[PDB]
């Protein structure tokens, strides 16, 4: 039993850094591991040595550099380079740190530098803090390279994100699952499957990505991952990085729960599968304003939401399959 200590800085940043510990220990084995939740600490309990932890990190960063150099001061189009990154100054600074550990971890040397965390990994960051009177200069939140590198590895593989640019503006929505009572390797590895690599949709037909609460449904639709949430308990945390008119700021940040959405989709896509995706995609593409009434009815069990969306969507175009109607009444009864 080693019980790797995890520093507590931010409830969201600590989620990313601690939840990203598993991607390295899997590369190094670490059989019989667990992750005890603490709300924000989220401590890993594993009976493994510290030496293989760096062997996990070197493989993870080799994968990161292979992804980065493949696409294209050099700026890629990956999650850690330009996908979820809203600030251009971190388009090249972030990879430079990632390759920097190649001169530090390969020959078994500890970290000595300390970098600046961007807003994408942790929204509470910024430039203008308040201590006693007025503001300051730069970013007072400075993160050591050890905890800095452990966040991007968990961010790229596990937590998904949706990007919808439409030319000058840009909307980035980031969702992540946080365990709250217990979790094991069965769930944390399964959550990795939800990641959407290169979620660059653009055009104009795919406008349904408006609003975060509507983009989460589209992200979840095409990922029929593990449905363990019917017996487990998990929470979804989401945040947006709006860049309307080249104005990088956060305008939407809400806390919801994913278990009821899991149950809704699990109970919906059971009688048939061919027509359910077609129906939901049609209502999302055509009934842009109507799918909000459908998504809102899920976290509160709203009866009128199950009808308003269908009413507003049928007028444009809807297949309206038979087996899916019986799926809604399975939740209703």
């Amino acid at each position: 039993f080693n019980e790797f200590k995890t520093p507590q800085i931010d409830p969201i940043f600590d989620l990313y850094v601690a939840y990203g510990y598993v991607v390295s220990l899997i590369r190094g084995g670490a059989k019989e591991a667990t992750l005890i939740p603490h709300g924000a600490s989220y401590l890993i309990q594993t009976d493994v040595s510290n030496e293989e932890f760096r062997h996990g990190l070197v493989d993870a960063l080799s994968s990161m550099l292979s992804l980065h150099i493949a696409l294209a001061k050099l700026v890629s189009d990956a999650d850690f380079s330009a996908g979820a990154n809203i600030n251009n100054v971190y388009w090249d600074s972030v990879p430079r740190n990632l390759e920097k550990l190649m001169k530090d971890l390969e020959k078994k040397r500890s970290v000595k530098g300390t970098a600046t965390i961007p807003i994408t990994l942790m929204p509470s960051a910024g430039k203008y803090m308040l201590k006693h009177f007025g503001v300051q200069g730069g970013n007072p939140i400075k993160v050591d390279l050890l905890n800095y590198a452990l966040a991007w590895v968990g961010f790229h593989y596990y937590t998904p994100y949706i990007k919808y640019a439409k030319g000058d503006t840009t909307w980035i929505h980031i969702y992540q699952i946080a365990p709250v009572e217990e979790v094991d390797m069965i769930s944390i590895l399964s959550l990795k499957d939800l990641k959407m690599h290169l979620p660059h949709y653009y055009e104009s037909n795919l406008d349904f990505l408006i609003n975060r609460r509507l983009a989460l449904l589209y992200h979840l639709l095409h990922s029929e991952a593990l449905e363990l949430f019917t017996e487990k308990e998990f929470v979804i945390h989401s945040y947006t990085l709006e860049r309307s008119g080249n104005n990088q700021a956060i305008r939407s940040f809400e806390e919801e729960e994913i278990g009821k959405l899991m149950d809704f989709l699990w109970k919906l896509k059971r009688r048939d599968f061919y027509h359910a995706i077609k129906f939901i995609d049609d209502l999302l593409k055509k009934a842009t304003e109507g799918a909000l009434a459908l998504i809102d009815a899920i976290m509160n069990e709203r009866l009128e939401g199950f009808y308003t969306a269908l009413k507003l969507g049928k007028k444009a175009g809807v297949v309206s399959s038979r087996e899916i109607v019986a799926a809604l009444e399975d939740i209703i009864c």
Partner: protein, 335 residues
């Protein structure tokens, strides 16, 4: 002087606390969550709530409106008339009044006298410190869980589309290159029964918090560093600023929504000295709890006058039957 108003409000179909419209087209209204106890458990609902920043901004708006009536309207900052509410800055030491007078930031004594807006809501000056606490405090406007107990569902969010017609040099319609402004967006309006609670601190108007008392004749008296006759006028300028609240001037989109506003029930306490707030207009047990809190303050030596509007509030309390906010103000302006 020291007035605590609270109660329940029935307003519906109102656009308050929108998401802007910088690039988002569907302007969905803010959505909140509230817990409610039922069937030996707790359940939540996605119901909107309005922040009290709207209430504070409208108090600021009404303060200058009722301050321009009296001939004492000279002592007011220029930024207050344009609804700025910046209150100087990290390096701004001079003030911009209606006549252009300059004010030096050295202490609250020379600030609350020459300026009136900076005293009700406070100010700050990081260059020289001297922060002023807001004398008026607002509360978040959220729907009561009694309405949830009797509803626990329904849409209660009216989504309506609005169109902005546009014309060309002769009446043509463009798509993406003709230079048109045709737009088709959505607006969500909120309904339900909410609650309100406002506290006023008129005892610190013209009296600095650092030296609230004179204390030079072995007799503690209020340290009114301003002229009493205009201090009394300033009392009403802030007391009547809550009148527009009880009429409909709440939130934004007033030109296009103007919430259907009518208070069903309220309770207030007025006193010469500091007094506790009764209850937020949220919990079901908001009457009897007040029935307790009054007897929790009378035994301590507080000359509290209770004003009730559409509530019996028992019979032992010497409450006054109030039928509107205006006669409450008229009964408070005397003292």
């Amino acid at each position: 002087m020291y007035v605590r108003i609270s109660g329940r409000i029935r307003l519906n179909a109102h656009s308050l606390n929108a998401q802007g419209g910088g690039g988002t087209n569907y302007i969905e209204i803010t959505k909140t969550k509230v817990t409610v106890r039922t069937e030996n458990g707790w359940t939540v609902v996605e119901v909107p709530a309005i922040t009290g920043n709207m209430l504070k901004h409208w108090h600021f708006v009404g303060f200058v409106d009722y301050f321009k009536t009296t001939p004492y309207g000279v002592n007011l900052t220029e930024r207050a008339l344009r609804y700025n509410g910046t209150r100087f800055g990290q390096g701004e030491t001079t003030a911009t009044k209606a006549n252009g007078a300059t004010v030096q930031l050295n202490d609250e004594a020379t600030i609350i006298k020459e300026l009136a807006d900076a005293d009700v809501h406070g100010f700050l000056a990081p260059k020289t410190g001297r922060r002023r606490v807001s004398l008026v405090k607002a509360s978040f406007i959220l729907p009561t869980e009694d309405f949830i107990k009797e509803v626990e569902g329904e849409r209660l969010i009216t989504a309506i589309k609005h169109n902005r017609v546009d014309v060309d040099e002769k009446g043509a319609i463009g798509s993406s290159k003709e230079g048109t402004a045709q737009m088709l967006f959505s607006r969500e309006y909120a309904t339900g029964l909410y609650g309100f609670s406002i506290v006023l601190d008129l005892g610190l108007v013209g009296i600095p918090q650092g030296l609230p008392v004179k204390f030079e004749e072995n007799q503690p008296r209020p340290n009114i560093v301003i002229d009493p006759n205009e201090r009394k006028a300033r009392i009403e300028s802030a007391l009547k600023a809550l009148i527009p609240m009880l009429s409909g001037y709440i939130g934004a989109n007033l030109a296009r929504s103007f919430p259907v506003f009518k208070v069903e029930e309220l309770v207030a306490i007025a006193s010469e000295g500091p007094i506790p707030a009764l209850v937020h207009g949220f919990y079901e047990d908001y009457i009897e709890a007040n029935r307790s809190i009054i007897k929790n303050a009378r035994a301590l030596g507080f000359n509290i006058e209770v004003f009730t509007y559409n509530v019996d509030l028992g019979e032992d309390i010497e409450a006054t039957k109030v039928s509107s906010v205006e006669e409450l103000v008229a009964n408070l302006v005397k003292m």
